[PDB]
Amino acid sequence: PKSVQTAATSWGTVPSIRVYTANNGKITERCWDGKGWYTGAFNEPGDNVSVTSWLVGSAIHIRVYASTGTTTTEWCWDGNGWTKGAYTATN
Ligand SMILES: OC[C@@]1(O)OC[C@@H](O)[C@@H](O)[C@@H]1O
Ligand SMILES: OC[C@@]1(O)OC[C@@H](O)[C@@H](O)[C@@H]1O
């Protein structure tokens, strides 16, 4: 059977949670900061998604790896918007 594909990350003690869903070639984002789920700003093409995040002090940084075909694109959140990162594959 078919299934959407998700990736999740969280930070802090509230916590904040971000869940990324690849569905029909589009990746969207759902967010929790303790008071209900809502739709996040992230919207990029892809059929597979992974994510990692880390804190520097109180500031979150998120990296989303979106794959279409053999091409993986890294998207970066650093507090002020999503930008394309420097990631490229080995071969
Ligand atoms: O406050 C929500 C938000 O700014 O949190 C950080 C990232 O998850 C963004 O995509 C998202 O819109
Ligand atoms: O632009 C932000 C950046 O430098 O952050 C660290 C890595 O995620 C890099 O690929 C990325 O380009």
Residue numbers in the entry: 0 to 90
What's written in the study?
Symmetric and chemically uniform, the macrocycle acts as molecular glue by masking the protein, simplifying the surface features, and providing a homogenous scaffold for controlled oligomerization and crystallization. In this work, we report modular protein – calixarene cocrystallization.
An isomorphous structure was obtained with PK‐RSL containing a Pro‐Lys N‐terminal extension.
